[model samples]
Target: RCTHLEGTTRVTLVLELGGCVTITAEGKPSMDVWLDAIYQESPAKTREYCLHAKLSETKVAARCPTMGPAVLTEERQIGTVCKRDQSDRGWGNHCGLFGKGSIVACVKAACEAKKKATGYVYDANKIVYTVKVEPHTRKTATFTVSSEKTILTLGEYGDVSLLCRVASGVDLAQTIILELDKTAEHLPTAWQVHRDWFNDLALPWKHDGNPHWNNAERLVEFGAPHAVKMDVYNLGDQTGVLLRALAGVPVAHIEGNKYHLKSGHVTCEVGLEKLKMKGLTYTMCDKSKFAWKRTPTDSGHDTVVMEVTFSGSKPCRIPVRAVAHGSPDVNVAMLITPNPTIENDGGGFIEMQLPPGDNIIYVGELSHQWFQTGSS
Candidate 1:
């Protein structure tokens, strides 16, 4: 056994050669001087030995007594030994056990752990990072909602009903949020289940309350492929209506009008009190003479269709005024189509009954073109 004791002063050393050997010294002795004393004490023997000594917080010194005066000292702060003081020296030596390209492997392992924790993956080759989220596990759906008629035609004090339907996806049990835009405040309307037409629920409009104030009570229910009837009351001419699901999308939109006229004979027994007339013209069918008259009925709501008799064998375009009880004097044009051609060169007379509202007097000549007069 060899026991070596090292201190700042006198050192006592023991060596096991043929047996236990102790050497005592009392002076400021260095390693070189001590080894030389040991060599001189054992003169007749040729024995080689190595001595390794650790300095205080500095380095590890290793020397071979037989190998001349060269002392091999290794820095304590290098390689695996550097890992001891990790405070200021960071992770430099944390991966020291792994050789060569261990730094890249350590970084890769750290990134993989981060990916597992946050559901994010990095692709260095593409220079992009991708994130993923788990899908929701609840039931979700969409519905199609629309109105039965896109347009509504009504008269004064008229009422109309339109069917609103949820065509697919959700049923009546599923709650739906219904909202009315600010523009819809002009229309007066109501809604009810188709099965229960007598029960009416009023919607918010101008005279009524505001729809936005009580949005929570706006939750409505509709069966799938079922219809909800909407009744409109006291609607004006050319009014717009809109109803939509508050949470989802649009439900219905309708247009209402009081007076809508189409091309044809006015056969309906409508009152002429509200009628106003204009655009009248007159000329002889024979290109000679023409005369007409205007008379009002006593009912104060009807107009008299007078007999327009004229002189000329050929056609004459005669101007006449058809007056109603409550309307003002207006201009009108009457084109005369004679039995004989106007080119026949003679005179003829004709009589006809004109309607109150719009009367197409002559089919051949464009009625309103006489008023255009000038270039476009």
Candidate 2:
């Protein structure tokens, strides 16, 4: 059994990591097991849960993971990554990391209602009773993994960052006050709040979801007097806007990882959101439908190619690739191939199950940017 990591900030789980193994431990006899799992003609249902029933018992290589499945040696060190938890709830979700010993970090999220001004700068019509969310010590500071798209509960429309760090203290869990278009609605009740990861970027990055789908210059179009102003409360040493997105980005746009600012910004001296946590660095991004056609860009399969390097050794470089071809075409496939340039730990599985009708995807420009949840 795994330890329940609720109030605790840090966790560790020894996953047969599949691909992102510790640097120094690569190329060993035990490493070959995962190198070819992709070549298998047929995979199984009892797998993908990491420690589901053990590969050997699943008719695969059980003792193949090698190294030490039981004995404690602390042989290598694999960096942290967040995995999204599959939930039946539409309004919220739990995404966390699995490290060496315990569950590193798990966050709870919900699309609750608030009686505040639009963008906290506009007016409101006062909607019905919304779930009054208290400061959950378990979720003291909202967290999210680097790969998880940066989302926030816009106080109105949904989308906010989930806590990823092993927090020592978050004296300020203040939410950034931002505004979208003026044509915002008070919105239907929570019952309507479903998984709509439109990806507003809260402190939105300057990259599009899929260039083939929409604009590549900047994620969204700023409306007049729509006034885009979001300031991060110096909520600790690790708080700021991540210019790169949490997921669904092209190969070239990401410079030094999801935390760094992309190029062309050297003139203004603007950089990335730099924060490092020892155990694991992650966060959460869960969407809610709220209404019709109110789906988020992340709701479908969002593709991204991540590279991971272990122990500063280039020999262990691996490219963790996952692509989303908008359904019909396999939504996500984590190609754990040996490519000496890319991070992979957080390349989580995508796709959400809705009521019944077909779901449409659009990575484009819109007039009412504020009305959308993860749009842009």
Candidate 3:
């Protein structure tokens, strides 16, 4: 007879050829197989436990188990509240709404309190609060409060100046120092405090203050006064001089020519010239039509000087270029007012004159080359 076991405990016998089967089974199955079956049954028992069922197999079989409905252990209400207090500053109270449920009532109460205390009519639209300082007052301050967390707390405090309309139809200025009580918990330590002051007449409210928490007084203060005074000078005029030149094919480039002079003085002298291959020279001041005049120097060369007698209100560019007869190296140089030093960068110089006029001296050089031609 062949024995087959279904699950782990029950054993069955089978006989072939239509013979009657007789089986005598042992007391228990193999220990390993029994342990394995016990281990496999553990997960089903755990599943039943997950459905809030007992671990007993009979109890589990009594009824089919299922996941129960969702149940809440605790809940949190999202809200905010503004609490205010004043010790000796003035009779002030914190007037603001807390949560969505109390927002309407809180806003109404705040507006009413604001009107009663300041004699100014205050109005609110949903979450926005507005108050007109005067009939002609065009400036207003706004603050927005919102949160994504379940609960949020926002508040503000300080001196408030309100322009109230009295019964006589005139505006009365009222100032009250309102302070907030320390009721806010779970405040973020990383949060920054911002404070603003609105100056209706002299200075308007601007971001011009240092906002920091005062550890001594436990409040925030913004901005400080650092007044300054400056002296004004009436400089009459200003002028600029720039000396420039074009590159000549066979000429030499001249640079770093400067002039030195004080107000009302022409003690310094300067000049410009182009030298030819034959040692002949052409002076830039040879043409009298230019702004610069040629003055004879004891050094035997003609010096070019531009006597700028008038002060200029603005900077001016004086373009000084030499006109040479032949293609000499035509590079220019310049001299500025108040100082007789020579400046010869490839670029020109700028001249500015204030009160005492500026003196400008210009100089340049020209080089000539000779090329030999082949015989035909």
Say which candidate scores most in lDDT. 1
Candidate number with greatest TM-score: 1
Residue by residue across 283-363, what tens digits does model 3's lDDT show?
222222222132312111111223221122222233333322342344232211112212122122222111111222233
- Candidate 1 regions exceeding 4 Å error are 1-194, 197-304, 321-376
Q: Which 10 successive residues of model 2 have the least lDDT summed?
A: 47-56
Per-residue accuracy of model 2 over 1-376 as CA lDDT, tens digit each: 1111111222232212122221111111101111101111111111000100100100001011112122211112221111221111211212122222111121111111221111111011110111111110011121122221222232321222322221111111111122211224542211100012222423212121211111111221211110111111111110112212222322121112111111110001111122111112222111221112332333222222221113322212222222233453342322222222212353222122222223332111211111112323
Rank order by lDDT, top first? Answer: 1, 2, 3
C-alpha RMSD values across all candidates: 49.6, 36.9, 46.0
Q: Residue 304 in model 1: shift from native, Å?
A: 5.5
Q: What lDDT tens digits, residue by residue, belong to model 1 across residues 250-275?
A: 22222231111111111111111221
Q: Between prediction 1 and prediction 2, which has the larger lDDT?
A: 1
Q: In model 2, where do residues sit more than 4 Å from their true spots?
A: 1-25, 28-164, 168-171, 181-376
Q: TM-score ranking from best to worst? A: 1, 2, 3
Q: lDDT values of the candidates?
A: 0.20, 0.18, 0.17
